[PDB]
Write an enzyme that holds these catalytic residues in place. Structure first.
Site, PDB file in Angstrom:
ATOM      1  N   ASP A 224      15.142   9.238  14.919  1.00 43.92           N
ATOM      2  CA  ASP A 224      13.907   8.493  14.710  1.00 43.92           C
ATOM      3  C   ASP A 224      12.766   8.814  15.673  1.00 43.92           C
ATOM      4  OD1 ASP A 224      15.480   7.175  16.806  1.00 43.92           O
ATOM      5  OD2 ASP A 224      13.960   5.598  16.714  1.00 43.92           O
TER       6      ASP A 224
ATOM      7  N   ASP B  97      21.788   9.665  16.362  1.00 45.21           N
ATOM      8  CA  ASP B  97      21.080   9.107  17.493  1.00 45.21           C
ATOM      9  C   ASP B  97      21.457   7.600  17.547  1.00 45.21           C
ATOM     10  OD1 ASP B  97      18.716   9.077  19.661  1.00 45.21           O
ATOM     11  OD2 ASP B  97      18.041   7.540  18.269  1.00 45.21           O
TER      12      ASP B  97
ATOM     13  N   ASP C  24      14.318  13.502  19.214  1.00 45.19           N
ATOM     14  CA  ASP C  24      15.145  14.070  18.167  1.00 45.19           C
ATOM     15  C   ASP C  24      14.456  15.218  17.445  1.00 45.19           C
ATOM     16  OD1 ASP C  24      17.229  12.136  18.567  1.00 45.19           O
ATOM     17  OD2 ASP C  24      15.986  10.686  17.483  1.00 45.19           O
TER      18      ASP C  24
HETATM   19 MG   LIG Z   1      15.946   7.072  18.838  1.00 45.87          MG
END
Ligand SMILES: [Mg+2]
Ligand SMILES: *[C@@H]1O[C@H](CO[C@@H]2O[C@@H](C)[C@@H](O)[C@@H](O)[C@@H]2O)[C@@H](O[C@@H]2O[C@H](CO)[C@@H](O[C@@H]3O[C@H](CO[C@H]4O[C@H](CO)[C@@H](O)[C@H](O)[C@@H]4O)[C@@H](O)[C@H](O[C@H]4O[C@H](CO)[C@@H](O)[C@H](O)[C@@H]4O)[C@@H]3O)[C@H](O)[C@H]2NC(C)=O)[C@H](O)[C@H]1NC(C)=O
Ligand SMILES: *[C@@H]1O[C@H](CO[C@@H]2O[C@@H](C)[C@@H](O)[C@@H](O)[C@@H]2O)[C@@H](O[C@@H]2O[C@H](CO)[C@@H](O[C@@H]3O[C@H](CO)[C@@H](O)[C@H](O[C@H]4O[C@H](CO)[C@@H](O)[C@H](O)[C@@H]4O)[C@@H]3O)[C@H](O)[C@H]2NC(C)=O)[C@H](O)[C@H]1NC(C)=O
Ligand SMILES: CCCCCCCC/C=C\CCCCCCCC(=O)OC[C@H](COP(=O)(O)OCC[N+](C)(C)C)OC(=O)CCCCCCC/C=C\CCCCCCCC
Ligand SMILES: CCCCCCCC/C=C\CCCCCCCC(=O)OC[C@H](COP(=O)(O)OCC[N+](C)(C)C)OC(=O)CCCCCCC/C=C\CCCCCCCC
Ligand SMILES: CCCCCCCC/C=C\CCCCCCCC(=O)OC[C@H](COP(=O)(O)OCC[N+](C)(C)C)OC(=O)CCCCCCC/C=C\CCCCCCCC
Ligand SMILES: CCCCCCCC/C=C\CCCCCCCC(=O)OC[C@H](COP(=O)(O)OCC[N+](C)(C)C)OC(=O)CCCCCCC/C=C\CCCCCCCC
Ligand SMILES: CCCCCCCC/C=C\CCCCCCCC(=O)OC[C@H](COP(=O)(O)OCC[N+](C)(C)C)OC(=O)CCCCCCC/C=C\CCCCCCCC
Ligand SMILES: CCCCCCCC/C=C\CCCCCCCC(=O)OC[C@H](COP(=O)(O)OCC[N+](C)(C)C)OC(=O)CCCCCCC/C=C\CCCCCCCC
Ligand SMILES: CCCCCCCC/C=C\CCCCCCCC(=O)OC[C@H](COP(=O)(O)OCC[N+](C)(C)C)OC(=O)CCCCCCC/C=C\CCCCCCCC
Ligand SMILES: *[C@@H]1O[C@H](CO)[C@@H](O[C@@H]2O[C@H](CO)[C@@H](O)[C@H](O)[C@H]2NC(C)=O)[C@H](O)[C@H]1NC(C)=O
Ligand SMILES: CC(C)CCC[C@@H](C)[C@H]1CC[C@H]2[C@@H]3CC=C4C[C@@H](O)CC[C@]4(C)[C@H]3CC[C@]12C
Ligand SMILES: CC(C)CCC[C@@H](C)[C@H]1CC[C@H]2[C@@H]3CC=C4C[C@@H](O)CC[C@]4(C)[C@H]3CC[C@]12C
Ligand SMILES: CC(C)CCC[C@@H](C)[C@H]1CC[C@H]2[C@@H]3CC=C4C[C@@H](O)CC[C@]4(C)[C@H]3CC[C@]12C
Ligand code: NA
Ligand code: NA
Lengths: 40, 294, 993
Positions: free
Chosen positions: C687, C346, C691
């Site tokens: 995070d 990410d 996700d």
């Molecule tokens: Mg992120």
């Protein structure tokens, strides 16, 4: 020898066990020493 | 998968490899295992070269001799009916197998049997444990010595009318000299009478104090009429140096046995180089559970 | 819980009006809802609070640990043992108590292993529970025409809700009136910068429009009003969390390896049992005995000590990770990192820092770079010119943000700053290389300031001059470089002033395009000294008319800014790429920024080019170039929505550097699935909540600890409590090291199986006295052997592990036939021969020569034969021969230990030699010493021949296994030699594990 050959049928297992235990203990000690040799 | 990994027709493979591969693996394992076998055989040959043919290197696990008997009891119990004949057959068969080795026909000529004192005597040393002198000579032991239990008169040996016999025997040990207890003030009660130094005494009794009364007359038969083993049949020089050797035997008739009741009879030998063990119930002594149910 | 209706992309009613909205849900735009109606709806549909996760009793997970794949094999083994005992009991009398002890021992082993694994997972669960900090929150709702602050759990759909900069958006709102209200959509949509929320509609995508507020989002600056459109679990992140919870777990690679291992062990066990059963029936035994023999052989062929050994191996590798701040919730997730071959990462919050920072600065016709790293470990920008001082004064003065009270302890970069992101970055840079800004600001009193207009696109203000020799007035303005450029006529070069001729104007244009192309946001700072003769010290410049010269100012320099990446991000990405791990960027951010971050971290290696780059370098349309000449590709989310499965497969099959931009969480999940469809392991590092569906479906999830979200933290498998990205490299290294160590330990524990089974086989076929007792096999499998197998984990690498390519899952397994050919075929055979040698020696020294042992078991076992003739003619009672047999068992066990010495030394290294690696593993040495001391203790301690039935040995017997041990060492030494000199030869494809 002859009639009184009684020793031909005896074995000192006691002394053997004593020595084997002393050796086992020593080996265990050495092992511990090597294991902790470095963390001091 | 299932079919392919078994046989494909493009690479001409079987089980995974070609023709020459299974051969390479088989040849490698054959050579490897062959070398393994040859090395093990060599290491065993050096061993065979380390031992002697006339004497066992270690004789400490057989120091106190055992005390076996002629009948083959499954649980050290002798139970048989005086009516049904097919009840004591397993006993007579064993007894016979044991006594069948003392046949006079087997003991004949000067070699290798030698006539020994008809009365207990002392030890006899036929030299050392070597091959210098030829096959040593062993004393003869006649069947007839055992009077009422010999299978010569009453083949059954007693089991036919409620009077069974028990042929006791001392375990053969190489170079073992049996030594009996001396006449000193310390000696069991029983052993006092008939202290023939040259005889190793054997005496049976009852395990429990109660059973005493229920046990009748223990009549022992042996060499010279004594209840023991003559010291002249020792020592034993081993199979290689004394083939055709016969060990003494002692017959025991348990006359006047209470009917329909389990009796525990413990037989025991006495002597200096004889010691019992609480773990091995056959070291020096032996137990029998007789029950003549009729 | 329809998953397909949850897998679809979010839809909405954004494209409407305020009247249509109020007419659909029912609500007064100026009075809101009524208390009675509000409560009627509150009770009609439910509080605005997400449902709690599905709890889990502790006995359930304890039962889970008691089962599995290995424990099940041991369970069936114990069951078989009790079955054989029942049989022996129903057919004969005096059943040897061997099967029952073995069964209770196996059950105890399984229970202990389960307790240990459960305790470890519980430890991790407790340290994980110490992070959920939930403080109640209350929203501002307008009912009946009054403002009231009520708990977040009391908000319903339809009422009016007001927000203020600093608060959190309660539910999904529909903005009706805003006043410069900015929002932080980083957790949900992944937008690094604050998107302004306006009542008007702008994009067809609800995540892109500005008239919709989202759940869990915070209002950075401004105030706004809105009608609650979505509430409770029905919100966007509510559906995302529900989807995450409604996903399967999967089956890690380590589990599949353990499964294929159990499959092989059962194949060889049932094969040897059925074969010796038919053979025994061909030799005359009865049915009852053949069944027992079969069960006994199938039980012997099983490793009871391998379970505890594998568990300790994995735990050992887990404690190191815990020492470096890498916590794993499960126990097998420690190996998945090493087997990974495609890492999907990410951008916002993972690859970057999610914090605006001053990147580049323009002054004195020269581009200067500033340090944009968390710990400030870099190069300064030459703070020796006067131009920089003037720039610092302009930025430090023309700025209204100030650090939040009480931050005197945190560092200059991690402290809280109340204000915009740009002003915050400027304030931090000035406070970083120019000292306390509070004194710099109090040193010059601000007299008049003109705020930032949407038309003026510039912020200006006049302050007094701290020069004790000059009482003039200072004017400083900042804004867009074009607007500021159109208002200047001089340039502060090296301190002096110069005209604004076209030469520097073109240099300024090139600098603007240079900083702009870098994906950064550039601003311009200028100032001017007001003549004290035309504007005395007493004249007040009220902000009403043109009191200051808009033009004729002095431009000092540009100041760019952008969110930089974490310190160890580039190095970690390079390390992963070196190990053959494909790095694919997956983020829902703008492509113009995603591509720049990709090139800056290593995803898009410098030199590679995209189809658009080629079309721009050639000046030709994009439809003409061939897509095969482009190694890296940037796939937009909008285009990803209309792509088939084969197209995605080809995208991953032909492009080595892929960057997915503007992808929704569902699309992230689709990408992960597209990567798995081929056959490679996937590791997703994230995070935020976007996700969560990606971390769950991936083979292994890595969630950030400090900057991560609670949902993604609870749905991940590994947590980075320090937010250090290098932990990924450390993990991929440990995953491999423990794999090669598991192979070595398995071969070690499997070699001893042959010298533990062959005796029984020869006992049944050759009818000889039992060579190896059951209590000795127990003292070997569960005793001595445990320590060395555990020590085999501490083995260091042989070659560079971070250099070889990832292991192929379809070809390179954990336990192949090359191992079985060694343990069961070559080493185990030698060990068995050594044991039989010591056996025959012990029996030959006491009087039983090898020629008379074949055929004695019938009478050697009989309990009523007190006269067994030996090779010399002696008569042995039953207990005496049994004592000798027990002494043979003791010597056999000691011989096993003696050969295990050389087996542990040849198992230490798989390819390298012992004289190269070295005996630096102290644990292995301690294992050998303890292994010997235990055997000596078990034999010489009084009362052992009664409890365990082990008699003392004579000093000459202990040396019967030494030659076999040295031979084993020599054979394996020459074996590990041809492999080195001849790479790829027969010895390699035949004995190289
Ligand atoms: Mg992120
Ligand atoms: C050691 O000595 C054993 C006894 O020797 C006998 O007595 C000594 C003192 C000498 O006089 C010697 O010459 C004697 O033979 C000897 O065992 C004996 O072997 C013979 C030969 O097989 C047996 O004779 C056979 O008897 C059966 C029936 O036996 C019944 O009694 C015995 C118990 O005595 C039971 O065990 C049986 O089950 C029976 O209940 C006859 O049926 C058989 O018939 C055969 O001979 C006749 C002619 O007579 C033929 O018409 C038939 O067709 C048969 O061919 C024999 O008559 C004798 O029973 C047996 N004695 C014992 C006690 O078992 C032993 O072999 C010697 N061993 C060595 C190594 O020297
Ligand atoms: C093994 O030992 C026994 C017993 O020995 C005696 O006890 C020992 C512990 C030790 O103190 C010895 O010194 C001690 O003698 C031997 O058998 C014993 O033999 C004597 C002698 O015949 C017997 O004594 C007799 O007792 C009779 C009544 O019980 C008595 O009438 C006898 O009279 C005879 O002797 C007197 C002189 O005293 C003489 O005038 C008579 O005309 C007649 O000859 C005699 O006193 C013991 O009773 C015997 N003991 C037992 C238990 O029977 C035994 O001979 C010996 N064996 C060997 C091979 O040495
Ligand atoms: C690098 C790794 C280092 C590892 C070191 C490990 C430490 C070793 C620890 C101890 C070993 C020493 C043991 C000594 C014990 C002697 C005790 C003893 O009194 O024992 C007598 C027995 C004879 O018994 P019996 O049956 O005859 O009498 C029985 C008579 N009753 C029973 C009637 C009494 O004898 C015996 O046990 C013989 C004892 C065995 C003899 C030791 C042989 C050593 C083999 C190889 C080493 C060679 C080294 C060379 C140096 C190279 C340097 C570069
Ligand atoms: C950080 C530093 C750590 C250092 C720690 C050091 C620890 C201490 C080290 C060594 C201590 C040595 C103790 C020696 C004990 C000798 C006992 C002994 O010789 O007894 C022999 C006799 C039994 O002979 P028997 O006639 O029955 O033979 C059978 C004859 N048949 C079968 C033919 C009839 O004993 C008997 O009668 C009576 C026996 C009474 C019970 C004694 C208990 C001994 C048991 C364990 C102690 C050994 C531990 C050693 C450490 C090993 C670590 C792994
Ligand atoms: C009293 C006397 C004592 C007796 C004691 C006996 C102790 C027993 C000792 C060892 C047990 C041996 C049992 C067989 C072990 C075979 C190992 C095995 O099955 O491992 C499994 C492997 C799988 O491996 P992978 O996963 O890497 O495959 C990957 C394939 N991918 C990647 C292409 C898909 O499957 C394979 O290897 C394919 C299967 C190959 C099977 C070969 C069978 C050979 C067995 C006997 C031959 C006897 C002939 C004797 C006559 C010789 C002529 C003179
Ligand atoms: C007839 C009887 C048959 C018996 C068969 C079974 C035998 C199995 C038992 C022992 C086998 C011993 C094999 C000896 C191998 C020695 C190898 C060696 O010496 O390779 C030298 C290494 C390499 O150094 P480098 O150049 O990489 O260093 C670089 C340093 N930098 C980085 C600073 C530059 O140096 C190092 O490993 C560092 C120093 C390590 C010193 C190890 C000494 C301990 C050795 C054995 C322990 C004894 C166990 C006894 C078990 C019995 C218990 C009763
Ligand atoms: C870093 C941490 C280091 C910690 C190291 C700890 C090391 C501990 C070292 C030594 C302690 C061991 C336990 C001591 C046992 C003393 C037993 C004892 O003194 O027995 C003496 C008497 C024998 O008398 P007797 O000769 O008249 O019998 C004649 C019998 N007739 C004539 C009928 C044949 O015993 C009897 O009677 C009954 C015998 C009872 C059997 C007890 C043996 C226990 C069995 C299994 C436990 C062993 C597990 C292994 C643990 C390894 C730990 C490392
Ligand atoms: C970290 C390093 C650990 C090292 C430790 C080594 C691990 C050991 C692993 C497995 C060994 C355990 C096997 C248990 C064997 C029990 C044997 C048993 O029950 O035999 C029953 C015997 C009956 O015999 P019989 O019929 O001939 O009697 C005839 C009596 N007449 C004739 C006079 C009437 O009764 C007797 O011996 C009575 C005396 C009872 C002796 C119980 C000894 C229990 C020994 C160990 C259990 C604790 C181990 C826990 C440590 C785990 C380590 C991970
Ligand atoms: C008490 C316990 C005693 C145990 C003693 C065990 C001693 C037995 C040791 C070895 C005997 C086995 C020799 C087998 C020779 C025939 C094997 C054969 O037919 O092989 C053919 C290949 C040549 O085909 P290629 O590769 O060119 O074709 C390429 C084809 N494609 C593609 C499949 C690779 O051969 C090659 O590669 C060359 C490889 C040859 C194998 C070398 C292994 C040497 C291992 C140990 C010897 C050291 C003994 C030390 C003992 C000291 C005692 C004190
Ligand atoms: C053998 O045992 C019997 C008893 O079973 C003894 O004979 C008994 O003697 C008592 C007198 O003490 C009489 O009352 C019984 O009537 C007798 N019973 C029988 C069956 O005779 C006999 O004395 C014992 N004989 C020997 C030599 O021990
Ligand atoms: C590193 C290698 C080569 C060292 C090998 C050491 C071997 C030979 C040592 C380790 C432990 C030793 C044994 C341990 C116990 C006993 C019992 C004792 O009553 C006599 C010595 C005896 C019989 C030892 C003989 C030698 C022995 C087996
Ligand atoms: C290094 C390895 C491969 C060499 C192995 C050599 C093997 C094959 C040799 C070593 C010792 C040899 C044996 C030694 C003793 C005997 C006894 C003799 O009366 C006949 C030969 C016989 C039966 C030999 C057969 C072959 C043998 C086992
Ligand atoms: C006690 C004695 C007589 C048993 C001898 C058994 C021998 C012949 C058995 C034991 C283990 C077996 C091997 C074990 C492993 C493999 C690997 C496999 O992919 C093909 C079969 C192969 C190559 C086997 C060949 C035969 C083998 C070596
Ligand atoms: Na998962
Ligand atoms: Na096993």
């Amino acid at each position: 020898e002859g009639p009184d050959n009684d020793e031909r049928f005896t074995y000192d297992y006691y002394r053997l066990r004593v020595v084997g235990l002393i050796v086992a203990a020593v080996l265990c000690v050495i092992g511990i020493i090597i294991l902790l040799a470095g963390k001091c | 998968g299932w079919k392919k990994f078994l046989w494909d027709s493009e690479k001409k493979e079987f089980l995974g490899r070609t023709g020459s591969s299974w051969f390479k693996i088989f040849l490698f394992y054959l050579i490897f295992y062959g070398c393994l076998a040859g090395i093990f055989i060599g290491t065993i040959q050096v061993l065979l070269l380390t031992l002697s043919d006339f004497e066992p290197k270690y004789q400490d696990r057989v120091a106190p001799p055992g005390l076996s008997h002629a009948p083959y009891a499954i649980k050290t119990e002798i139970s048989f009916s005086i009516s049904n004949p097919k009840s004591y057959e397993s006993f007579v068969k064993s007894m016979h197998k044991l006594m069948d080795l003392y046949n006079e026909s087997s003991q004949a000529g000067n070699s290798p049997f030698e006539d020994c004192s008809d009365t207990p005597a002392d030890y006899i040393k036929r030299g050392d444990l070597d091959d210098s002198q030829g096959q040593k000579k062993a004393c003869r032991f006649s069947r007839m010595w055992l009077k009422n239990c010999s299978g010569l008169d009453d083949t059954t040996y007693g089991y036919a009318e409620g009077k069974p016999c028990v042929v006791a025997k001392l375990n053969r040990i190489i170079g073992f000299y049996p030594k009996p207890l001396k006449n000193t003030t310390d000696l069991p009660e029983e052993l006092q009478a008939n202290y023939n130094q040259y005889v190793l005494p054997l005496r049976c009794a009852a395990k429990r104090e109660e059973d005493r009364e229920k046990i009748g007359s223990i009549e022992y038969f042996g060499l010279g009429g004594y209840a023991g083993f003559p010291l002249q049949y020792y020592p034993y020089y081993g199979k290689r140096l004394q083939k055709k050797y016969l060990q003494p035997l002692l017959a025991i008739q348990f006359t006047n046995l209470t009917q329909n009741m389990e009796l525990r009879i413990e037989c025991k030998v006495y002597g200096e180089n004889i010691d019992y063990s609480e773990k091995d119930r056959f070291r020096g002594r032996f137990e029998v559970k007789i029950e003549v149910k009729s | 819980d329809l998953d397909e209706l949850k897998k679809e992309v979010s839809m909405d009613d954004h494209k409407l009006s305020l009247d249509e909205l109020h007419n659909k849900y029912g609500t007064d735009l100026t009075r809101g809802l009524t208390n009675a109606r509000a409560k009627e709806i509150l009770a009609r549909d439910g509080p605005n609070s997400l449902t709690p996760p599905p709890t889990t009793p502790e006995w359930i997970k304890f039962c889970r640990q008691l089962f599995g794949g290995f424990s099940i094999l041991l369970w069936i083994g114990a069951i078989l043992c009790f079955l054989a005992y029942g049989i022996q009991a129903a057919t004969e009398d005096e059943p040897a108590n061997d099967n029952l002890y073995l069964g209770v021992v196996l059950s105890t082993v399984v229970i202990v292993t389960g307790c240990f694994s459960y305790y470890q997972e519980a430890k991790s669960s407790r340290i994980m529970d110490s992070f959920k900090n939930m403080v109640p929150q209350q929203a501002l709702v307008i009912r009946d025409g009054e403002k009231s602050t009520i708990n977040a759990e009391f908000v319903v759909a339809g009422d009016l809700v007001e927000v203020k900069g600093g608060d959190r958006i309660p539910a999904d709102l529909r903005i009706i009136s805003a006043h410069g209200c900015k929002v932080d959509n980083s957790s949900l949509t992944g937008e690094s910068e604050p998107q302004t929320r306006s009542p008007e509609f702008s994009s067809e995508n609800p995540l892109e429009t500005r008239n919709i507020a989202f759940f869990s989002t915070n209002c950075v600056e401004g105030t706004a009003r809105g009608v609650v459109v979505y509430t409770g679990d029905r919100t966007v992140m509510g559906r995302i969390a529900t989807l995450a919870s409604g996903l399967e777990v999967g089956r890690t690679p380590i589990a599949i390896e353990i499964e294929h291992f159990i499959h092989i062990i059962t194949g060889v066990a049932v094969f040897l049992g059925v074969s010796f059963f038919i053979l025994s029936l061909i030799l005359g035994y009865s049915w009852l005995e053949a069944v027992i023999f079969l069960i006994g052989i199938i039980v012997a062929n099983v490793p009871e000590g391998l379970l505890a050994t594998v568990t300790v191996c994995l735990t050992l590798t887990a404690k190191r990770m815990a020492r470096k701040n890498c916590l794993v919730k499960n126990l097998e997730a420690v190996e998945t990192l090493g087997s990974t071959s495609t890492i999907c990462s990410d951008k916002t919050g993972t690859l970057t820092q999610n914090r605006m920072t001053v990147a580049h600065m323009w002054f004195d016709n020269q581009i200067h770079e500033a340090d944009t790293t968390e710990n400030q470990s870099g190069a300064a920008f030459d703070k020796t010119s006067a131009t920089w001082s003037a720039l610092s004064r302009i930025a430090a003065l023309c700025n209204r943000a100030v650090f939040q009270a009480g931050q005197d302890n945190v560092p200059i970069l991690k402290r809280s700053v109340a204000g915009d992101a740009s002003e915050s970055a400027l304030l931090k840079c000035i406070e970083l290389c120019c000292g306390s800004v509070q004194g710099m600001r109090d040193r010059n009193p601000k007299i008049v300031e003109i705020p930032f207009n949407s038309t003026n696109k510039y912020q200006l203000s006049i302050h007094e001059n701290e020069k004790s020799s000059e009482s003039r007035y200072l004017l400083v303005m900042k804004g867009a470089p074009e607007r500021i450029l159109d208002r200047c006529s001089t340039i502060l070069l090296n301190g002096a002033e110069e005209p604004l001729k076209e030469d520097m104007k073109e240099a300024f244009q090139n600098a603007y395009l240079e900083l702009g192309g870098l994906g950064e946001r550039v601003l311009g700072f200028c100032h001017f000294a007001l003549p004290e003769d035309k504007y005395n010290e007493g004249y007040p410049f009220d902000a009403d008319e043109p009191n200051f010269p808009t033009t004729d100012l002095c431009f000092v320099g540009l100041m760019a800014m952008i969110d930089p990446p974490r310190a160890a991000v580039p190095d970690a990405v390079g390390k992963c790429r070196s190990a053959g791990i494909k790095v694919i960027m997956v983020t829902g951010d703008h492509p113009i920024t995603a591509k720049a971050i990709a090139k800056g971290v290593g995803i898009i290696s410098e030199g590679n080019e995209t189809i658009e780059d080629i079309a721009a370098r050639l000046n030709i349309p994009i439809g003409q170039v061939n897509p095969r000449d482009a190694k890296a590709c940037v796939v937009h989310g909008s285009d990803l929505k209309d792509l088939s499965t084969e197209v995605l497969d080809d995208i991953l099959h032909y492009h080595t550097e892929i960057v997915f931009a503007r992808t929704s969480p569902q699309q992230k999940l689709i990408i992960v699935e597209g990567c798995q469809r081929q056959g490679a392991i996937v590791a997703v590092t994230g995070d935020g909540v976007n996700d969560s569906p990606a971390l769950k479906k991936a083979d292994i999830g890595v969630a950030m600890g400090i900057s991560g979200s609670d949902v993604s933290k609870q749905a991940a498998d590994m947590i980075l409590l320090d937010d250090n990205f290098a932990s990924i490299v450390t993990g991929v290294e440990e995953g491999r090291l423990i794999f090669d160590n598991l192979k070595k330990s398995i071969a070690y524990t499997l070699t001893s199986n042959i010298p533990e089974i062959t005796p029984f086989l020869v006992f049944i076929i050759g009818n000889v006295p039992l060579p190896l007792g059951t209590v000795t096999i127990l003292c070997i499998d569960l005793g001595t052997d445990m320590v060395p197998a555990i020590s085999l984990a501490y083995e260091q690498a042989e070659s560079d592990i971070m250099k070889r390519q990832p292991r192929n899952p379809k070809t390179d397994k954990l336990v192949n036939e090359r191992l079985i050919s060694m343990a069961y075929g070559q080493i185990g055979m030698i060990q068995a021969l050594g044991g039989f040698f010591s056996y025959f020696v012990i029996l030959a020294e006491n009087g039983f020569l090898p020629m008379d042992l074949i055929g004695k078991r019938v009478r050697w076992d009989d309990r009523w034969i007190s006269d067994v003739e030996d090779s010399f003619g002696q008569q042995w009672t039953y207990e005496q021969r049994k004592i000798v047999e027990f002494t043979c068992h003791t010597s056999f066990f000691i011989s096993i230990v003696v050969v295990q010495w050389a087996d542990l030394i040849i198992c230490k290294t798989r390819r390298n030699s012992i004289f190269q690696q070295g005996m630096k593993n102290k644990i292995l040495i301690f294992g050998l010493f303890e292994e010997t001391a235990l055997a000596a203790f078990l034999s010489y301690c009084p009362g052992t021949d009664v409890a365990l039935r082990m008699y003392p040995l004579k000093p000459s017997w202990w040396f019967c296994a030494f030659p076999y041990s040295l031979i084993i060492f020599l054979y394996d030494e020459m074996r590990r030699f041809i492999i080195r000199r001849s790479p790829g030869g027969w010895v390699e494809q035949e004995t190289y594990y």
